[PDB]
Curated annotation (Swiss-Prot), chain B:
It comes from Thermus thermophilus (strain ATCC BAA-163 / DSM 7039 / HB27). The chain holds residues 1 to 35 of 71 of the full protein. Part of the 50S ribosomal subunit. Belongs to the bacterial ribosomal protein bL31 family. Type A subfamily. This is Large ribosomal subunit protein bL31. Transmembrane segments: none annotated. Zn(2+) binds at C16, C18. Binds the 23S rRNA. The gene is rpmE.
UniProtKB/Swiss-Prot annotation, chain C:
Keywords: Ribonucleoprotein, Ribosomal protein, RNA-binding, rRNA-binding. This is one of the proteins that bind and probably mediate the attachment of the 5S RNA into the large ribosomal subunit, where it forms part of the central protuberance. One of its GO terms (biological process) is translation. This is Large ribosomal subunit protein uL18. It comes from Thermus thermophilus (strain ATCC BAA-163 / DSM 7039 / HB27). GO terms for molecular function: 5S rRNA binding; structural constituent of ribosome. Part of the 50S ribosomal subunit; part of the 5S rRNA/L5/L18/L25 subcomplex. Contacts the 5S and 23S rRNAs. One of its GO terms (cellular component) is cytosolic large ribosomal subunit. The keyword rRNA-binding applies. Belongs to the universal ribosomal protein uL18 family.
UniProtKB/Swiss-Prot annotation, chain E:
Belongs to the universal ribosomal protein uL16 family. This is Large ribosomal subunit protein uL16. It comes from Thermus thermophilus (strain ATCC BAA-163 / DSM 7039 / HB27). The keyword Ribosomal protein applies. InterPro entries: Ribosomal_uL16, Ribosomal_uL16_bact-type, Ribosomal_uL16_dom, Ribosomal_uL16_sf. One of its GO terms (molecular function) is tRNA binding. Binds 23S rRNA and is also seen to make contacts with the A and possibly P site tRNAs. Keywords: Ribonucleoprotein, Ribosomal protein, RNA-binding, rRNA-binding, tRNA-binding.
From Swiss-Prot, chain F:
InterPro entries: Ribosomal_uL5 (IPR002132), Ribosomal_uL5_bac-type (IPR020930), Ribosomal_uL5_C (IPR031309), Ribosomal_uL5_CS (IPR020929), Ribosomal_uL5_dom_sf (IPR022803), Ribosomal_uL5_N (IPR031310). Forms a bridge to the 30S subunit in the 70S ribosome, contacting protein S13; this bridge is straddled by the 5S rRNA. Contacts the P site tRNA. Part of the 50S ribosomal subunit; part of the 5S rRNA/L5/L18/L25 (TL5) subcomplex. This is Large ribosomal subunit protein uL5. It comes from the Bacteria. Pfam families: Ribosomal_L5 (PF00281), Ribosomal_L5_C (PF00673). HAMAP family: Ribosomal_uL5_B (MF_01333_B). GO terms for molecular function: rRNA binding; structural constituent of ribosome; tRNA binding. The keyword RNA-binding applies. GO terms for biological process: translation. Coiled coil: none annotated. This is one of the proteins that bind and probably mediate the attachment of the 5S RNA into the large ribosomal subunit, where it forms part of the central protuberance. In the 70S ribosome it contacts protein S13 of the 30S subunit (forming bridge B1b) connecting the head of the 30S subunit to the top of the 50S subunit. The bridge itself contacts the P site tRNA and is implicated in movement during ribosome translocation. Belongs to the universal ribosomal protein uL5 family.
Length: 185, 35, 99, 50, 141, 181
RNA sequence: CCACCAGCCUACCAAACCCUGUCAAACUCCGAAGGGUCCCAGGUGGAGCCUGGGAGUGAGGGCGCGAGCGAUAACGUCCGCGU
RNA sequence: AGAGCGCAAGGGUAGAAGGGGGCCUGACUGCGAGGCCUGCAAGCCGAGCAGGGGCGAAAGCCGGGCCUAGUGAACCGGUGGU
RNA sequence: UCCCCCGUGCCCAUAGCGGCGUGGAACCACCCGUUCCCAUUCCGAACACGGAAGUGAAACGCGCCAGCGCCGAUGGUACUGGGCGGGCGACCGCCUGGGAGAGUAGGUCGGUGCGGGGG
């Protein structure tokens, strides 16, 4: 959705940050300049739209331009967000990480077993004109001891792939019990 | 196949088990045997 | 496949690059430092004689005398595939003193 | 080292010298090899003394 | 009680630890996360004591996953021998963990299971720590 | 280019057959023959020495060539001779020696084999080769009992233009090569 | 499971690789601040060069900051830079 | 270039040093500008000079081996030559 | 004078790879015959000699999916010659000068010196 923005100049990080803002550096193919936004609404809004969806940041320079983030670079010590980078919107064969929602209640589950998800945001491609929001996929007939993955996922028509694709998406695993302390021996 | 020490060649035949007339050229002198 | 810088042996301190292939001899005098050559002479691309053995010989010498009007002294034989077969051009009579 | 030893040579035809070492174990009988006699031009040299 | 296996050498020097962690601060594996937080060593006793608290209270639950690995030669010396000779031997197989270094993640439980487990677990360690969820550590390889 | 039985046979028939079946608009790309290897690993030259080389020389002496022995690589702890230098003969067959050898082989070294049904087809490279080894060396025509010590079998090897099993095996059918099929 | 040979299996042991992730004073694809020093220029100062004449001095130690036997113990502590 | 390169490690090298062979024998005599190091002693490299060799047809290569331990000032005596 | 292929040096993997196109008269790979050369721990596969038959496929230069590969800033931290400050410890923070790798967009299947074969 919509967020603020401001053109950045030759100012240094800490200032913008420790004040109550956060700097960025947008680009797209033929672009690479520097920008920034405000903190509180950044933090808040990133919970919702995020890299899950598309951002439409408003520049006071006029153009309320829609882009996408990516690269965010934490401070790693007493940490939190500390420098988002921005790719800009196009229509070319672009790639990103689509969020997911695995739905249902299968057979490994219920008995006590537990799913091991290996991906929620996934490596795929599309044209930004498309809006393949967040893919909600299959978890009906699952069983412990087996795995599902690869090119076995649903496609909102058009969306091509970008992996190998035998990348393991998930697998159901046998839980942990204090009878593994019988192994403690 | 040149050199100086080579196990020789030269004409050889085949006398099968059926009264044959076949023409060959091999390393050992003469040969005749089977089908 | 005769890398080995056989040319390092030829990176001694003077060169002379040539070649032989199908029906043609490719003989050229090269000075180096930048890789600036100098002299030229071929087998059939010269409308010389029509036999590889003989031609070869004198073609070397041909180029040699030409080089004598251009000013040289000593160099090194440059080639990758050879076994070295004299080719009594052997660019030796061919000015160079060669061998 | 010893039991592997070390040796020298004289000039065949009345003396001229040089200094190296030796080797045992191997079937290495006598040993003469080309060198230069200090006096006179290129001769061989033979194994004398120790 | 796991470790490597007498790799290359067996005695290695002490250490002073300012702050960097080298990284390794996110989910990727499962879900709910326990995050270590001080400049110190992770004790094997506390490794499987955390594992205790876990499968202890939460039994017949789900699956828990690891990113860490305790391996350090505690150069210990014999007692009353008077100081000097030698360095010492590889006891206290601790690991090297600084502030902000996360480490433990649970999956397949209720929110509160994680919560309580992480409470008592934190009550055990030779220091203390924090805990959180899944939303803003997406993209970290 | 001295022509024999299977030589001329190979020549004519294989050309239109091969290219009408597989298609090849080239004198030099149409799949043909290449090389053959006679191979003899017998690491008994731990001791025994070159009395065994007498035995080994006999092998290619009767095929008509002067063979080059090949040593071992490294330590065969179980089978002595570590550093690797016993007796592992091999001799290479060019275009025309291939003719005589293949001819004999296909005529005398096969219709014999006591339980002869054919040669295993799945003994293929997939990269257009066919390696095959055999038990008794004494089945050859130019050898008679009084010369041999025991069984000096050999893993014969052949390379071809062939890039798959198809072409080479069909070729073999043309040039009279037994097969388990 | 078959002796004409092989069809087959794997709540197992499990090479590799994969991807989720990471540990390294004696590992390094990378690589700092730099440091060392070389030529031009600055730099008259209990500067710098040579000689020789006479010397004392050859456990230093505080504190910082950095590696170590030390237990992130000692006003133990041997080097390092710094004083 | 993870083989290997004599023994350990590091470096490094198949544009060899490794691996196959022919002829040989510079594992040279008397000097060496020059310097690294360096209290001293010591260790070390070295193109070029006159002698005069070996191979490569030559341009040229060799004043022992790819390198860093295999080495021990002095006093005293044996040894042949001069 | 704008200009087609090869002996061949330099740029350091954008030059390398699977593949995709490639030419042949001339160049080249060859082809061809072991008479010449000398060569193979065996084999003319390595190299010479000689051609009418004769190939453009396997080989090179040259034109490409750019999947792999390598090239990779922009911004920020990680620390830090230098200076000034708080600790049960362990640690830290502000200035000065710095600026990685990583994340990222992104880029290339070749850039080029001489000499000789020419529309």
């Amino acid at each position: 959705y919509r967020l603020k923005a401001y053109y950045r100049e030759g100012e240094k990080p800490s200032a913008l940050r420790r004040a109550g803002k956060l700097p960025g550096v947008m680009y797209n193919r033929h672009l690479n300049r520097k920008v920034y936004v405000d903190l509180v609404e950044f933090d808040k809004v990133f919970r919702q739209a995020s890299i899950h969806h598309v951002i439409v940041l408003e520049l006071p320079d006029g153009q309320s331009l829609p882009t996408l983030v990516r690269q965010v670079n934490l401070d790693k010590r007493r940490r939190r967000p500390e420098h988002v980078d921005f790719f800009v919107l196009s229509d070319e064969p672009v790639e990103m990480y689509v969020p997911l929602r695995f739905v249902g209640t299968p057979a490994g589950v219920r008995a006590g077993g537990v799913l091991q998800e290996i991906h929620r945001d996934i490596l795929v491609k599309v044209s930004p004109r498309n809006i393949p929001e967040f893919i909600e996929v299959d978890v009906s007939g699952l069983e412990i001891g087996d795995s599902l993955h690869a090119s076995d996922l649903k496609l909102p028509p058009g969306v091509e792939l970008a992996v190998s694709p035998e990348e393991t998406i998930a697998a159901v695993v046998p839980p942990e019990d204090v009878e593994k302390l019988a192994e403690e021996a | 196949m040149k050199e100086g020490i080579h196990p020789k060649l030269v004409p050889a035949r085949i006398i099968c088990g059926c009264g044959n007339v076949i023409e060959t050229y091999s390393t050992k002198p003469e040969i005749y045997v089977e089908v | 496949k005769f890398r080995v810088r056989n040319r390092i042996k030829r990176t001694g301190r003077l060169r002379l690059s040539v070649f032989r292939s199908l029906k043609h001899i490719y003989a050229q005098i090269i000075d180096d430092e930048k890789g600036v050559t100098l002299v030229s002479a071929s087998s059939l691309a010269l409308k010389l004689k029509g036999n590889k053995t003989e031609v070869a010989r004198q073609v070397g010498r041909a180029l040699a005398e030409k080089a004598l009007a251009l000013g040289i002294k000593q160099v090194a034989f440059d080639r990758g595939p050879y076994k070295y077969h004299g080719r009594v051009k052997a660019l030796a009579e061919g000015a160079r003193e060669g061998g | 080292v010893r039991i592997k030893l070390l040796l020298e040579c004289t000039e065949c035809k009345r003396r001229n010298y040089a200094t190296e070492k030796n080797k045992r174990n191997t079937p290495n009988k006598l040993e003469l090899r080309k060198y230069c006699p200090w006096c006179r031009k290129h001769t061989v040299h033979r194994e004398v003394k120790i | 009680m796991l470790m490597p296996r007498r790799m290359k050498y067996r005695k290695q020097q002490r250490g002073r630890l300012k702050g960097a962690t080298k990284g390794g601060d996110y989910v990727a594996f499962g879900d709910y996360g326990l995050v270590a937080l001080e400049p110190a060593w992770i004790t094997a006793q506390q490794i499987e004591a955390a594992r205790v608290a876990m499968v202890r209270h939460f039994r017949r639950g789900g699956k828990i996953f690891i990113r860490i690995f305790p391996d350090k030669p505690y150069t210990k010396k014999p007692l009353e021998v008077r100081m000097g000779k030698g360095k010492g031997n590889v006891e206290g197989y601790v690991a090297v963990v600084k502030p902000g270094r996360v480490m433990f993640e649970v999956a397949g439980v209720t929110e509160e299971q994680a919560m309580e487990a992480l409470r008592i677990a934190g009550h055990k360690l030779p220091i203390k720590t924090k805990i959180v969820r899944r939303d803003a550590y997406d993209e970290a390889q | 280019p001295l022509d024999v039985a299977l030589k001329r046979k190979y020549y004519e028939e294989v050309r239109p057959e091969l290219i009408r079946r597989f298609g090849y608009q080239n004198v030099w790309e149409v799949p043909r023959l290449e090389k053959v290897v006679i191979n003899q690993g017998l690491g008994e030259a731990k001791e025994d020495a070159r009395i065994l080389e007498k035995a080994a020389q006999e092998l290619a002496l009767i095929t008509g060539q002067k063979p080059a022995v090949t040593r071992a690589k490294k330590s065969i702890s179980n089978f002595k001779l570590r550093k690797g230098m016993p007796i592992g003969l091999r001799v290479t067959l060019r275009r025309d020696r291939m003719w005589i050898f293949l001819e004999k082989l296909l005529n005398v070294a096969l219709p014999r084999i006591r339980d002869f049904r054919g040669l295993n087809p799945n003994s293929f490279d997939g990269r257009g080769n066919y390696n095959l080894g055999l038990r008794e060396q004494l089945i050859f025509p130019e050898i008679t009992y009084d010369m041999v010590d025991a069984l000096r079998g050999m893993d014969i090897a052949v390379v071809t233009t062939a890039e798959t099993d198809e072409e080479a095996r069909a070729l073999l059918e043309l040039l009279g090569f037994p097969f388990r099929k």
